[PDB]
Design a binder for these strands. Structure first.
Ligand SMILES: Cc1cc2nc3c(=O)[nH]c(=O)nc-3n(C[C@H](O)[C@H](O)[C@H](O)COP(=O)(O)OP(=O)(O)OC[C@H]3O[C@@H](n4cnc5c(N)ncnc54)[C@H](O)[C@@H]3O)c2cc1C
Length: 450
DNA sequence: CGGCCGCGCA
DNA sequence: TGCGCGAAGCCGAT
């Protein structure tokens, strides 16, 4: 079950005498992981062990206790899963560019393998690691069903050009996973404690000093991810087609935090949803979201390295937004007023409070939320900066290609078309308070989140 | 040339 | 709550 098009050489070299090392980064799971499975196969043909290495950087300081604890509790459970497969795991601290190089030398590695991410910083680390090693280095796309570089060889302007190219390749690339074969040939607790202490003075607090974040909505880890997948199929999938854009209903999958950390495979989710007997419109709507919209977000970041900037917007949108730079805004809020939910719009404020208290804003209100940031900020650049700052600080699923592609759709028209013409926002598709009012029970959502 | 919200009306 | 239109630009299959 090993298609060669899932893997490519980052660097050629002379293979070594030691273990195959899988540098895990994006795909924090033992099951349904093409990068670990390929590493295990290479190790088996060479008659040597496989081992896993993960580098804990100082990036955590830029987000919060909420993401750091979600990731680390998962990693504690993963450490135990890999051990039942007699696969050892090593947890390094510091800059990957230096630390993965040094580990490959200190540990006498034969081959290095990593998983795939289109984000800049991963590419920076790979470049540094390449400069400091002499062994072969491969990349495996463990996150997408169709490998990103195979689905398309260029940036796609719309879902409607990407969709036929991806779907033509599903009969080949959508397949079951083989079982991971076991090997035959300081603590994370201390790291968690130290990290939580370092972040404690910047934690999200109410006026009484009691924390805003509520950790009981999504329990972390590979076993919990699977339980959420299974309850989506049993209890929420049937009504997904009708209710996915109603934020007063809990009818989304709730999978995004697990998908973001790679605690569950999207290919796995697609296999199970394809085989579920349920509402045909719901299945089609859901599969289009997890296949086309998710995988087109990797396409966007992979072929546009300025993906978090105004430069990445399409020309029609840059030309429209530029012409409206001098328009008076109805309101202007600072980062801190947006963050504390202190606008004049109670629907906007409630969306921000759902984000602060749960770490997961409903998908429909994320669109509305980001578009009002544009409408009530000094400039398009300040808008993009504020939405990215709050998305990445407070979403459990943030710092993700879906986030940059979703924010760029909302603010800059990426994967959209010119739609209407207004002051400030020009031809960027508009969404209104009264528009929401006639689609769902706006007052119920506001009451639920203060 | 084909084909991707808010308002009015059941 | 569901459906069709309005007011509309651009990429890519020809
Ligand atoms: C302004 C804005 C910011 C966003 N930020 C993020 C983010 O930081 N991280 C993130 O994962 N998603 C982001 N999204 C996309 C989307 O809103 C979330 O993925 C979704 O709400 C997660 O909830 P769910 O898994 O229950 O969704 P479901 O409806 O159950 O969908 C299942 C999966 O399909 C994919 N998906 C759904 N919608 C989109 C979309 N619009 N674009 C790309 N993939 C999609 C996701 O992988 C998602 O988990 C953002 C969208 C917008 C408009």
């Amino acid at each position: 079950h090993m298609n060669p098009k899932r893997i490519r050489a980052l660097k050629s070299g002379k293979q070594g005498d030691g273990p195959v090392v899988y540098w895990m980064s994006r795909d924090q799971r033992a099951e349904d992981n093409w990068a670990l499975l390929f590493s295990r196969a290479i190790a088996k043909e060479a008659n040597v062990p496989v081992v896993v290495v993960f580098c804990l950087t100082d990036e955590f300081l830029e987000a919060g206790i909420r993401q750091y604890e979600f990731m680390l509790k998962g990693l504690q459970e993963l450490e135990v899963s890999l051990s039942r497969k007699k696969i050892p795991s090593f947890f390094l601290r510091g800059d990957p560019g230096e630390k993965i190089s040094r580990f490959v030398k200190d540990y006498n590695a034969g081959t290095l393998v990593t998983d795939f991410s289109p984000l800049r910083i991963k590419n920076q680390w790979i470049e540094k690691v390449i400069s400091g090693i002499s062994i072969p280095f491969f990349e495996v796309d463990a996150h997408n069903v169709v490998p990103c570089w195979e689905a398309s060889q260029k940036h796609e302007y719309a879902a409607h050009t990407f969709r036929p190219k991806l779907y033509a390749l599903l009969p080949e690339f959508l397949e079951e996973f083989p079982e991971l074969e076991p090997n035959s040939v300081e603590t994370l607790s201390d790291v968690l404690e130290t990290g939580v202490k370092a972040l404690l003075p910047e934690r999200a607090l109410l006026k009484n000093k009691d924390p805003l974040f509520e950790p009981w909505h999504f329990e972390p880890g590979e076993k919990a991810a699977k339980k959420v997948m299974e309850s989506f199929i049993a209890d929420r999938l049937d009504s997904y087609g009708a209710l996915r854009n109603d934020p007063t209903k809990n009818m989304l999958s709730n999978l995004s935090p697990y998908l973001h950390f790679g605690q569950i495979s999207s290919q796995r989710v697609v296999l199970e949803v394809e085989k579920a007997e349920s509402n045909p419109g719901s299945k089609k709507a859901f599969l289009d979201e997890i296949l086309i919209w998710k995988e087109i977000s990797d396409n966007f970041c992979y072929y546009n390295p300025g993906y978090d900037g105004f430069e990445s917007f399409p020309s029609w949108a840059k030309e429209s937004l530029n012409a409206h730079r001098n328009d008076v805004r109805s309101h202007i809020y600072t980062l801190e007023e947006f963050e504390a939910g202190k606008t004049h719009d109670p629907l906007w404020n409630a969306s921000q409070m759902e984000l602060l208290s749960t770490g997961k804003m409903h998908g429909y209100t994320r669109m509305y939320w980001a578009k009002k940031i544009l409408e009530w900020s000094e400039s398009p650049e300040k808008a993009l900066e504020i939405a990215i700052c709050l998305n990445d600080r407070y979403e459990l699923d943030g710092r993700d290609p879906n986030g940059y592609a979703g924010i760029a759709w909302s603010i800059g028209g990426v994967h959209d078309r010119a739609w209407g013409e207004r002051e400030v926002t020009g031809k960027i598709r508009y969404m209104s308070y009264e528009g929401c009012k006639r689609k769902f029970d706006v007052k119920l959502y506001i009451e639920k989140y203060s």
